[PDB]
Coordinates of C-alpha atoms in Angstrom, one line a residue:
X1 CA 149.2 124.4 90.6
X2 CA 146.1 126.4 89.9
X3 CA 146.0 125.0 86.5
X4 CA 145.4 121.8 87.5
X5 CA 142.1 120.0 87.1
X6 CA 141.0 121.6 83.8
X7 CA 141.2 118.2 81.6
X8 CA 139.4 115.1 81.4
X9 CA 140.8 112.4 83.3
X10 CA 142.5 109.4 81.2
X11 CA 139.6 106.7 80.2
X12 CA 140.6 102.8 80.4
X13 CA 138.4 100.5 78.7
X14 CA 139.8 96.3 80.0
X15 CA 138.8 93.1 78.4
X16 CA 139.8 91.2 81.6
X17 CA 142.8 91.1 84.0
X18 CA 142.0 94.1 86.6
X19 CA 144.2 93.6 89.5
X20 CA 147.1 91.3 87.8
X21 CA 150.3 91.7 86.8
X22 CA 150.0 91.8 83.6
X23 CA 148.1 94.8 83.5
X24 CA 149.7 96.2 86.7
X25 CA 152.0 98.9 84.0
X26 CA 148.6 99.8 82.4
X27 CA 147.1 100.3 85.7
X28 CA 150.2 102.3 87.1
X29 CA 150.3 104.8 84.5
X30 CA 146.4 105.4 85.0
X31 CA 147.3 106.8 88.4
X32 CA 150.5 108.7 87.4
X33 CA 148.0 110.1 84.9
X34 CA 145.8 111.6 87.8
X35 CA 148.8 112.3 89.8
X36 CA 150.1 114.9 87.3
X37 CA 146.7 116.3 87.3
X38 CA 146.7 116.9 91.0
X39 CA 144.8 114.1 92.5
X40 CA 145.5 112.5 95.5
X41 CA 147.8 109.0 94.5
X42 CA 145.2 106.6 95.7
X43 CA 143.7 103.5 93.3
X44 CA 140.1 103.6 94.5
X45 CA 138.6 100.6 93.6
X46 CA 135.0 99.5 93.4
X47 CA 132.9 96.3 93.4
X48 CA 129.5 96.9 92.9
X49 CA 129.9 95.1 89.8
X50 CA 129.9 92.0 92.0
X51 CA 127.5 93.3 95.1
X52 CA 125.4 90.0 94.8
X53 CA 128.3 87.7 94.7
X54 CA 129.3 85.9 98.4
X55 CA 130.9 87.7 101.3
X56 CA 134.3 85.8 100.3
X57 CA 134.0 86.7 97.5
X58 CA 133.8 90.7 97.5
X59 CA 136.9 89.9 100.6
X60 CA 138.7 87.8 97.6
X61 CA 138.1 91.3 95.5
X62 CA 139.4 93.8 98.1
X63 CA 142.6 91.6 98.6
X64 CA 143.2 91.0 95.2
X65 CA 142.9 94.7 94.3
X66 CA 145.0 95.7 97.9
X67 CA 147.7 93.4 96.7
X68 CA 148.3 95.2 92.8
X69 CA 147.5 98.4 95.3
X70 CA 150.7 97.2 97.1
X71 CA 153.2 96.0 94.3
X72 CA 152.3 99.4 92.2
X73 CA 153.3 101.6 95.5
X74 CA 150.1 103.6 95.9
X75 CA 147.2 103.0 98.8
X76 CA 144.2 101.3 97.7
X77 CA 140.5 102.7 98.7
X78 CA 138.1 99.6 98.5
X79 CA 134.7 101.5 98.6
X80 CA 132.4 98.4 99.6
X81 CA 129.3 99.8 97.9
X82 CA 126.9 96.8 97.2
X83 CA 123.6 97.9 97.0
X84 CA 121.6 101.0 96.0
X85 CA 121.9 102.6 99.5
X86 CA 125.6 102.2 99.8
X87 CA 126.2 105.0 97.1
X88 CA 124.5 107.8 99.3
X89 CA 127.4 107.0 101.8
X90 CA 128.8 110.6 102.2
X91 CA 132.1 109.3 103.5
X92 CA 132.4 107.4 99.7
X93 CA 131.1 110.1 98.2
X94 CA 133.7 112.2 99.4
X95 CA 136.0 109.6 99.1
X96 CA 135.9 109.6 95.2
X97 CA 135.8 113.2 94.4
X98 CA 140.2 113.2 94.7
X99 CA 141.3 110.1 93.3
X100 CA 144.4 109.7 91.1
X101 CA 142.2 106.4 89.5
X102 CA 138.5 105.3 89.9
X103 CA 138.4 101.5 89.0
X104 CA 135.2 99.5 88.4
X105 CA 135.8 95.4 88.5
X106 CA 134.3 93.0 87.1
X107 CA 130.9 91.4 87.8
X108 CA 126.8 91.8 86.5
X109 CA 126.7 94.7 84.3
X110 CA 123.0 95.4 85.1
X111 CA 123.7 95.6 88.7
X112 CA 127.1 97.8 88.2
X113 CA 124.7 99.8 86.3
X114 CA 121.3 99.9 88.2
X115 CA 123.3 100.3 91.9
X116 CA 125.1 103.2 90.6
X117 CA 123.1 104.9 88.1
X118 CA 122.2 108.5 89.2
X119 CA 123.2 108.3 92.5
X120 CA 125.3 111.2 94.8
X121 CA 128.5 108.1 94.3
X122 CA 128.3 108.1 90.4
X123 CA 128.3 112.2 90.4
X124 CA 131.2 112.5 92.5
X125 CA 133.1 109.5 90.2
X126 CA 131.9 111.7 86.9
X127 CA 133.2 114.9 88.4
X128 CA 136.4 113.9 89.5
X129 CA 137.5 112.2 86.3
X130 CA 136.3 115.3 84.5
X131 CA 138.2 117.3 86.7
X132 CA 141.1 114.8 85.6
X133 CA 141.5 111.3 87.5
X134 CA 141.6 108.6 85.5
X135 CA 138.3 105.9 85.1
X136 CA 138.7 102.4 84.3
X137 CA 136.5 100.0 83.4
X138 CA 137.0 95.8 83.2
X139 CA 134.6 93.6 81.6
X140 CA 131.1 94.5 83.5
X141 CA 132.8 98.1 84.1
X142 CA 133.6 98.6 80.8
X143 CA 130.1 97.4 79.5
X144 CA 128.1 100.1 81.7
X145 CA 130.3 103.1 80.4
X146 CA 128.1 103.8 77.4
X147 CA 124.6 104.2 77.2
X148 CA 122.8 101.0 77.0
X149 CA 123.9 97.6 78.2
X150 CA 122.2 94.8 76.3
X151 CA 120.0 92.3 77.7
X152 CA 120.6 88.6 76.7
X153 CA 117.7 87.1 78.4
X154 CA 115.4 89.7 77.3
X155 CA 115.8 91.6 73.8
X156 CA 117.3 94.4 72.0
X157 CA 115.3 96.3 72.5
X158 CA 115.4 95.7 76.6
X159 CA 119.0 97.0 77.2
X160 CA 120.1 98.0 80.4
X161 CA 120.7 102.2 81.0
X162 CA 124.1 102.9 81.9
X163 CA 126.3 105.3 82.4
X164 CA 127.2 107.0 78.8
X165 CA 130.5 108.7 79.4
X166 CA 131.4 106.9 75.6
X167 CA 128.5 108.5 74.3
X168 CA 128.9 106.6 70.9
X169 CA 131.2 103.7 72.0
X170 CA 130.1 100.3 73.4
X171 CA 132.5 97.9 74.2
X172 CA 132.1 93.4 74.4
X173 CA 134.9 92.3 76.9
X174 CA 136.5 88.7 76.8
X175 CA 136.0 89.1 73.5
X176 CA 137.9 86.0 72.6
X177 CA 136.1 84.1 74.7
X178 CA 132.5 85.6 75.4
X179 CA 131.0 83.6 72.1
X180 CA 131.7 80.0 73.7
X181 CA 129.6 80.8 76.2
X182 CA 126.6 81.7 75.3
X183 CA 123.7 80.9 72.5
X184 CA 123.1 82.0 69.0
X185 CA 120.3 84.6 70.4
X186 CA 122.4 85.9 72.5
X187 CA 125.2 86.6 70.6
X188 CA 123.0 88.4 68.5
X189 CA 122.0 91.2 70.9
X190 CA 125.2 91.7 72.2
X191 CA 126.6 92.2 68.5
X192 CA 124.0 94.9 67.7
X193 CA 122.0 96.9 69.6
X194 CA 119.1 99.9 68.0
X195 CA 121.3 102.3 70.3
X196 CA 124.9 102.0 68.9
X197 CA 127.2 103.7 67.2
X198 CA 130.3 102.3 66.6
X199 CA 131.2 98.9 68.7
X200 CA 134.5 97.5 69.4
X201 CA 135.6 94.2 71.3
X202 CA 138.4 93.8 73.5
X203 CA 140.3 90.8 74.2
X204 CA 141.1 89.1 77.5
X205 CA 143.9 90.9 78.9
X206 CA 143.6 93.6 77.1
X207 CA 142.6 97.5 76.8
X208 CA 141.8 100.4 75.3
X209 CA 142.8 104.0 76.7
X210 CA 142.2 107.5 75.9
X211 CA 144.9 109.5 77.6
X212 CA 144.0 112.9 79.7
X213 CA 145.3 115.5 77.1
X214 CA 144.8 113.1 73.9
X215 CA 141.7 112.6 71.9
X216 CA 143.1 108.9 70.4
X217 CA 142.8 105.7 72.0
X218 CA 145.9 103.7 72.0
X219 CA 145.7 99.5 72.4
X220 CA 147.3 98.0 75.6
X221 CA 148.0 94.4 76.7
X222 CA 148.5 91.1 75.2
X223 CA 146.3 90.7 72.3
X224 CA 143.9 92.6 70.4
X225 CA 141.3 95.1 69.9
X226 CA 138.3 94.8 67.6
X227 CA 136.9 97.3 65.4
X228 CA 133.5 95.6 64.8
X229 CA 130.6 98.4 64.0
X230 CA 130.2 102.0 63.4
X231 CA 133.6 102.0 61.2
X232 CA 135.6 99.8 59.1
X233 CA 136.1 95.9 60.6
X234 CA 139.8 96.2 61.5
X235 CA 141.8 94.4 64.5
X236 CA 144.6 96.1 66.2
X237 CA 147.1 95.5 68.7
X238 CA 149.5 96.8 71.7
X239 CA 150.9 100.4 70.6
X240 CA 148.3 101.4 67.5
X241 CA 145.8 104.4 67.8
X242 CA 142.2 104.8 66.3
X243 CA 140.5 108.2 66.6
X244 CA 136.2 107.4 67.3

């Protein structure tokens, strides 16, 4: 009992497919992994990613996240935090400081980011998964874990701040499917910004996790991983392990 909460939370890097069956195991065992470290067995989920998007929408986001809530057997927390002022809310902030799994969907990136960045909501979602709940990030969530999120319309040199809990990782979702839409320029900055390390993509309905007690990340889902920057081009899939 008191030697719980000493180990950093499980990290879940998605391609696409929060909410959906397919990923409904790799969600699962995100919040057995903060259970076993002692934190209350809800799947908090968070939409800021999407704040600007229609009120149906963000409604279409909270039942589609209550409903993989509901087939996994835990209770869902939507936190409805869609502008800057929403993440001094002291009821969310309180909220996200015990939860088995932290969840970011999909959406803008440089909203997710610039909403959440340095605010009371983002301290209390960094110290509970250090003090072991697991933090999961699709597409947009994924994009504003590390330190910069580029900047298509703008430069390379114009990236985004985020979050940088993968200090040298970035990460391009869809990966499969992000190049058909969008121009030569763009492409460009996403596949190499001045601030990274080593860069992987990750497939639609795919992940990447680092388990709480591991210092590998293991491949999850239905197609692959790409090791693109930063170490040797390589592509793996479902069950292999790379150390960054």
């Amino acid at each position: 009992l008191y030697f719980q909460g000493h180990m950093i939370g499980s990290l879940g890097l998605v391609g696409s497919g929060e909410y959906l069956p397919a990923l409904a195991e790799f969600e699962k065992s995100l919040i057995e992994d903060g259970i076993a470290n002692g934190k209350k067995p809800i799947f908090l989920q968070i939409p800021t990613a999407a704040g600007r998007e229609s009120e149906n929408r963000i409604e279409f986001w909270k039942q589609l996240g209550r409903q993989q809530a509901d087939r996994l057997g835990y209770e869902s927390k939507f936190l409805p935090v869609l502008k800057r002022e929403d993440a001094d809310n002291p009821e969310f902030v309180e909220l996200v400081k015990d939860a088995a799994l932290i969840y970011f969907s999909g959406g803008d990136p440089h909203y997710l980011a610039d909403t959440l960045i340095n605010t009371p909501l983002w301290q209390g979602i960094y110290e509970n998964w250090q003090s072991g709940g697991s933090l999961a990030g699709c597409s947009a969530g994924a994009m504003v874990l590390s330190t910069h999120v580029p900047n298509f319309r703008l430069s390379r040199h114009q990236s985004t701040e985020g979050f940088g809990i993968i200090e040298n990782v970035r990460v391009i979702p869809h990966f499969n499917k992000f190049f058909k839409w969008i121009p030569d320029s763009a492409a460009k900055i996403l596949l190499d910004l001045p601030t990274d390390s080593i860069l992987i993509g990750i497939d639609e309905v795919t992940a990447l996790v680092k388990r709480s007690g591991t210092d590998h990340w293991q491949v999850v889902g239905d197609a692959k991983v790409h090791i693109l920057k930063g170490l040797p081009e390589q592509q793996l899939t479902a069950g292999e392990s790379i150390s960054f």
